[PDB]
From a paper:
Here we report the cryo-EM structures of the trimeric S proteins from the BA.1, BA.2, BA.3, and BA.4/BA.5 subvariants, with BA.4 and BA.5 sharing the same S protein mutations, each in complex with the surface receptor ACE2. The RBD may exhibit “up” and “down” conformations in reference to the viral surface, and only the “up” RBD can expose the binding site which is responsible for mediating the interaction with the peptidase domain (PD) of ACE2. This interaction triggers the conformational changes of the trimeric S protein to further expose the fusion peptide in S2, which then facilitates membrane fusion with host cells.
In addition to 12 common mutations with BA.1, BA.2 has 4 distinct ones—S371F, T376A, D405N, and R408S—on the RBD. The structures of the ACE2-PD-bound trimeric S proteins from BA.2, BA.3, and BA.5 were determined at overall resolutions of 3.3 Å, 3.4 Å, and 2.8 Å, respectively. Therefore, three ACE2-PD molecules are bound to the trimeric BA.2/5 S protein. In addition, D405N is less favored by the nearby amide groups in the neighboring protomer (bottom right). Scrutiny of the local environment suggests that the shift of the N343-glycan in BA.2-SA and BA.5-SA is a direct consequence of the mutation S371F, which is found in BA.2, BA.3, and BA.5, but not BA.
Numbering used by the authors:
A (entry chain B): 735 to 826, 854 to 939, 944 to 1027
B (entry chain A): 979 to 1124
C (entry chain C): 735 to 783
D (entry chain A): 27 to 66, 81 to 140, 153 to 172, 187 to 210, 215 to 247, 264 to 621, 640 to 676, 690 to 734
E (entry chain C): 540 to 588
Write the structure that this text describes.
Amino acid sequence: SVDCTMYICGDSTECSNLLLQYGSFCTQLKRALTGIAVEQDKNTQEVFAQVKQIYKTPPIKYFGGFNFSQILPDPSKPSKRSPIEDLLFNKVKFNGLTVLPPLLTDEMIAQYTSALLAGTITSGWTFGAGPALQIPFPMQMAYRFNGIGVTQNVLYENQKLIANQFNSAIGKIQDSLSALGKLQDVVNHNAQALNTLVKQLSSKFGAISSVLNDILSRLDPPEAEVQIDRLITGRLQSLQTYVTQQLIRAAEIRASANLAAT
Amino acid sequence: DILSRLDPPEAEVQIDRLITGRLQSLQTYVTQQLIRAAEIRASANLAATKMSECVLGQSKRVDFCGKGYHLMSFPQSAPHGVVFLHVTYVPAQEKNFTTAPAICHDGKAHFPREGVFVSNGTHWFVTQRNFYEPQIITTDNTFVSG
Amino acid sequence: SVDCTMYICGDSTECSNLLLQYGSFCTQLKRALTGIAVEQDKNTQEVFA
Amino acid sequence: SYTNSFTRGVYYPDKVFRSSVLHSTQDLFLPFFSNVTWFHNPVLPFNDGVYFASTEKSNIIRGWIFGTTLDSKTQSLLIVNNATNVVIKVCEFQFCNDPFMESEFRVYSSANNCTFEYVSKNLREFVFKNIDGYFKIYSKHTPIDLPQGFSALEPLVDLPIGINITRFQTLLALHRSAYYVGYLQPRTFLLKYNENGTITDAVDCALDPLSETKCTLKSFTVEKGIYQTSNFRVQPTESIVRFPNITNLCPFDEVFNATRFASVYAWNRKRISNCVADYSVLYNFAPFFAFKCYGVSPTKLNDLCFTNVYADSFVIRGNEVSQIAPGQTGNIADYNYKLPDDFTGCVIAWNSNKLDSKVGGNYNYLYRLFRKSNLKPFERDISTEIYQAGNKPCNGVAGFNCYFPLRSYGFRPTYGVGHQPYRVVVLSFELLHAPATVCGPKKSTNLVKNKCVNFNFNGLTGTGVLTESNKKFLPFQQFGRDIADTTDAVRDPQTLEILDITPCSFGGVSVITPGTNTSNQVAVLYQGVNCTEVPSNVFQTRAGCLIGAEYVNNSYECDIPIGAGICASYQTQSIIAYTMSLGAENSVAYSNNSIAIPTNFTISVTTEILPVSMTKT
Amino acid sequence: NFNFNGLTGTGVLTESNKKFLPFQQFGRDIADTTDAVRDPQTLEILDIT
Ligand SMILES: *[C@@H]1O[C@H](CO)[C@@H](O[C@@H]2O[C@H](CO)[C@@H](O)[C@H](O)[C@H]2NC(C)=O)[C@H](O)[C@H]1NC(C)=O
Ligand SMILES: *[C@@H]1O[C@H](CO)[C@@H](O[C@@H]2O[C@H](CO)[C@@H](O)[C@H](O)[C@H]2NC(C)=O)[C@H](O)[C@H]1NC(C)=O
Ligand SMILES: *[C@@H]1O[C@H](CO)[C@@H](O[C@@H]2O[C@H](CO)[C@@H](O)[C@H](O)[C@H]2NC(C)=O)[C@H](O)[C@H]1NC(C)=O
Ligand SMILES: *[C@@H]1O[C@H](CO)[C@@H](O[C@@H]2O[C@H](CO)[C@@H](O)[C@H](O)[C@H]2NC(C)=O)[C@H](O)[C@H]1NC(C)=O
Ligand SMILES: *[C@@H]1O[C@H](CO)[C@@H](O[C@@H]2O[C@H](CO)[C@@H](O)[C@H](O)[C@H]2NC(C)=O)[C@H](O)[C@H]1NC(C)=O
Ligand SMILES: *[C@@H]1O[C@H](CO)[C@@H](O[C@@H]2O[C@H](CO)[C@@H](O)[C@H](O)[C@H]2NC(C)=O)[C@H](O)[C@H]1NC(C)=O
Ligand SMILES: *[C@@H]1O[C@H](CO)[C@@H](O[C@@H]2O[C@H](CO)[C@@H](O)[C@H](O)[C@H]2NC(C)=O)[C@H](O)[C@H]1NC(C)=O
Ligand SMILES: *[C@@H]1O[C@H](CO)[C@@H](O)[C@H](O)[C@H]1NC(C)=O
Ligand SMILES: *[C@@H]1O[C@H](CO)[C@@H](O)[C@H](O)[C@H]1NC(C)=O
Ligand SMILES: *[C@@H]1O[C@H](CO)[C@@H](O)[C@H](O)[C@H]1NC(C)=O
Ligand SMILES: *[C@@H]1O[C@H](CO)[C@@H](O)[C@H](O)[C@H]1NC(C)=O
Ligand SMILES: *[C@@H]1O[C@H](CO)[C@@H](O)[C@H](O)[C@H]1NC(C)=O
Ligand SMILES: *[C@@H]1O[C@H](CO)[C@@H](O)[C@H](O)[C@H]1NC(C)=O
Ligand SMILES: *[C@@H]1O[C@H](CO)[C@@H](O)[C@H](O)[C@H]1NC(C)=O
Ligand SMILES: *[C@@H]1O[C@H](CO)[C@@H](O)[C@H](O)[C@H]1NC(C)=O
Ligand SMILES: *[C@@H]1O[C@H](CO)[C@@H](O)[C@H](O)[C@H]1NC(C)=O
């Protein structure tokens, strides 16, 4: 969120009466940025908040062999993240600019993910269409092979082999991590727009100076109104560029959130 | 007021200020419509996809044609859009039973052809997975392997 | 791509020095056009390769 | 006294018609729920307009008096209304100090130079204002301590008078055989018009924490939710200007105390350098007799800056000090010392009889009184060539037409004023090309901490809170900047300590409302403001400070989202804050040989709405 | 092309069905554009399409 008056004018009060003479440009900026701010929380709810109840796994945590400890939460942590989630988060104020916090904390998101994991491992896909119906996991895997055209005895006669091979295959995932460039790019693109927006305040745009107080200190009002009006136009153009790009870039992350929710 | 209290060489300067301001505002207006126009088009493409896949067919895609198991959908028109009426199948009133992956008989392993083996406490039956309807375990609804 | 200096000034030293008073507008222009030019090769790899 | 208005003093801001249009206007009104004085009389102030209500079936109020002096010798306004009709009049009056058969009108006794004439229970309201020489009156008479309701007032007159007003009085009908006074302030309202074009309701903006809203949405009905309406900005106090010390005074103390001065014909010349110059030694130094400053004023010697400060000193006779000045003549100023016509220096001159006045003649100080032609400004001539006035060359022998060019004063203590030796010193500045040089002395100002203040550290101008830092500058660096090149630390010139700088503490202000159809209670969130810097129920969240809602330990479904897991609801009434509930808690009875199978089902029907088109423009 | 004591504009004048207050000269639709005036001489409200 950008404070239009503090970005353009900046502290000065003689400027505020001049900025009012350009109409509702500062109202448009606030409305446009609020639209983005509301959609970004909805994007997250649609991807993760697809479960009614918060499911938990049973204490034993032994599902016919298959070992899921690398994707289930670690009870010996303040954050209750999984071992793989701990790796995933280890790789990625100014002149009127502020950053608002998300509505959902990352603890709350972790609770949606653990509910999806606990629902699936114990009831497969039945809880997404109604009540959760328990079935042993080994039998869940056998139905899944049947869905791809493999006869179900292939699992039941080879249950140990598939469970042991799976456990190593999932174990290799950490080695490939210890990738997330698509997540760092989102951070970089916004950091670059905020670093550029601030740097554009040190530009004269063809005026005598770039500071709205220094103009007055060494110039009469009749001519100072012209010099300040040039700087206002230049910095107002900066805000229009910034907000237009945030709308175009927010449509791209929204399309990605729709794919992730799907 | 600009063409009445200024000479021509002085009024041109003031007209350019109005043209610049009003042109900037009008050019902003049209750019914002291009940005919104891409969004309504994307929504219309989703509505067209659901029209084929939810109304002219039966979809298996999860949470694409309502919540539950898709049976059928009916369209209704709206002023600037479309309303879909989605009819879904939802199971209710479950009970627990006991299961086994296979049955041993004559030293051989029997598997269900299209169901699950269940036990009501004393006898074993075969049911279909989405509706409780027990059948006697026979050689007509099972197959042998191993 | 468009070279901002050739478009705006066109081989003129008086104009070229004046471009220094506007800050980093050309930096934004080059990155904006380059960032979408790289995606165009990605678009064709994802369809055929 | 002070009565509590409710929604009173609302008048039609102008002509123009308007149907169903929640129009927003800025003008001079009586604020809603204001403190209005009560009278049952003395001259009252005006300052900016007046609200005037009253109650009574009879007519006790018999006009008003306005103006600047409320007396004769200047024109004033007088408004009366007998049983006929209102009479506006603007003359020069002479008012009774207590103005009031059935004979009346003992208010004034003079009506000169009239510039305007005109002739032609119960609540009688008036609004008076005076803008650009126009004196407006709104009024309405509505039949029934004042009651409670809304009624907009229509224009009554339009009076191109020109009159200034700063005070006024009232007139009452005595017994021989109750009124209100408010004032107007610049406020903003949101006015609701009916289909007939009249004002039926209004919202006072900049008042309650709520209304601060009705003005942002342009409505009188707000739907449940959370609205960003304004912002919080901490303000700086005090202005501290820090600076170095002095290093060197640049000792005037000698040039103005030299025990052996110089005779005028060969006058000494001391040039100041880059220094600290404190002329407060002088202006408040000795007793002095003559101190005249030509280029700059004697007090502004300590806020300018010049390159080379030349200082001349000598001694001369009493009545000749009138010749050390731009553009003079005489045996001394002609050719001993010539000041130019565009002088910028500062002349000081005093009496020194007791210090350079010895008995029996003190023949040390000479003064030339023969020369070919007059001198050049600031030039110097010390020769001793024998003069030649006649036509025969001298060959360096005194006598006839060959005179020695140097004489000597005397100065015995028994002289009158105008012949005792005076000491004269002159200062002269000149700023050739130097970037900076010796300037005046700097007035410090202490240095406070942990407070938002307006600071200046020897040229560095800014605003913010000063705190002890943990950075280490190099032993030549004054201040530091952060990435993006903004100053974030300075060094105090006097104490040589590094202090961090941080802006005040602004942020948005949002209003949390259950909906005007539920309640008029509200809570306010100050976004990322610490609860110690805001200026009951104060709740600290990662999103700021929430005031006006109670935080409970239960967990509900989210209703109004605040942020960082916190929501608000209207349940327990009042307004509360809390941490959202994601959902219930289900524990599936999992085992390695148990299955659940449905025995029944339901057919469910849901809808989905999707936009397909927009308007073609 | 009309002018009503200062109000300058263009449009078609027609008999209205609005009722002004007995101090109002004209009015402005939503978005604040003049859409009706009163004739100073005859005191009748006219719409300005
Ligand atoms: C699930 O896998 C984890 C490893 O990913 C197992 O935990 C490790 O077990 C080995 C011995 O087999 C120990 O040397 C490691 O110290 C264990 N790691 C940790 C973090 O404790 C775990 O035992 C497996 N679970 C089951 C039921 O086999
Ligand atoms: C499991 O289901 C079977 C079939 O319904 C039950 O066995 C029958 O029970 C009925 C009475 O409900 C008797 O009339 C039949 O003779 C029974 N059949 C046989 C082959 O014995 C059985 O009782 C059920 N088990 C439980 C624990 O309810
Ligand atoms: C100019 O010289 C005089 C005398 O040389 C200084 O006066 C002295 O005054 C102080 C204050 O009363 C005494 O304590 C000293 O004893 C005096 N000096 C002597 C030698 O007795 C005077 O201070 C000098 N001017 C300045 C500006 O310092
Ligand atoms: C500037 O002058 C002040 C005095 O006005 C100096 O303050 C002294 O600082 C030292 C430590 O550096 C202390 O021991 C002294 O007691 C201080 N004097 C007083 C009167 O408080 C300060 O050091 C000077 N600054 C510089 C850079 O020389
Ligand atoms: C399936 O059977 C289980 C027990 O084997 C039932 O789960 C228990 O239900 C009681 C309440 O009736 C709870 O107090 C226990 O804590 C439950 N146990 C566990 C492990 O969660 C369950 O209700 C049965 N399901 C159905 C659909 O009848
Ligand atoms: C399956 O559930 C439905 C209800 O969803 C049962 O039908 C209801 O039966 C009760 C009792 O006879 C009636 O009062 C209701 O009117 C019925 N509802 C409807 C919508 O018809 C039905 O009996 C259940 N089936 C079985 C086999 O138990
Ligand atoms: C302005 O003057 C005209 C006449 O020039 C007035 O017109 C009269 O209007 C009344 C009705 O209001 C009619 O009964 C008269 O017959 C009209 N006179 C003529 C000569 O046509 C008009 O009323 C005046 N306007 C105002 C506001 O006084
Ligand atoms: C009028 O307002 C003052 C504060 O400005 C308050 O102290 C006083 O009680 C008010 N008077 C009434 C009658 O409400
Ligand atoms: C009413 O007062 C005015 C002003 O004093 C005066 O001119 C007029 O004659 C009065 N009318 C009567 C009937 O006295
Ligand atoms: C009114 O009287 C004042 C003197 O009191 C005089 O200056 C002024 O000219 C007079 N006005 C007229 C219109 O005669
Ligand atoms: C009213 O008084 C002000 C000074 O307070 C003065 O400048 C102004 O000219 C006066 N107005 C008239 C109409 O005399
Ligand atoms: C005034 O408004 C009322 C509704 O509040 C309506 O019934 C009435 O007709 C209006 N009067 C006129 C003259 O239009
Ligand atoms: C809103 O007000 C109407 C009456 O005007 C009432 O019927 C309705 O219940 C109210 N809604 C709420 C949520 O209180
Ligand atoms: C507010 O400031 C105090 C110190 O004055 C500090 O203890 C507290 O943690 C601060 N609150 C926040 C939210 O930073
Ligand atoms: C909430 O519970 C905590 C302990 O978990 C307690 O310290 C606190 O006082 C409680 N808050 C309220 C409002 O009762
Ligand atoms: C069944 O689960 C129990 C734990 O509840 C476990 O001890 C046992 O080994 C499992 N049986 C088989 C055949 O996997």
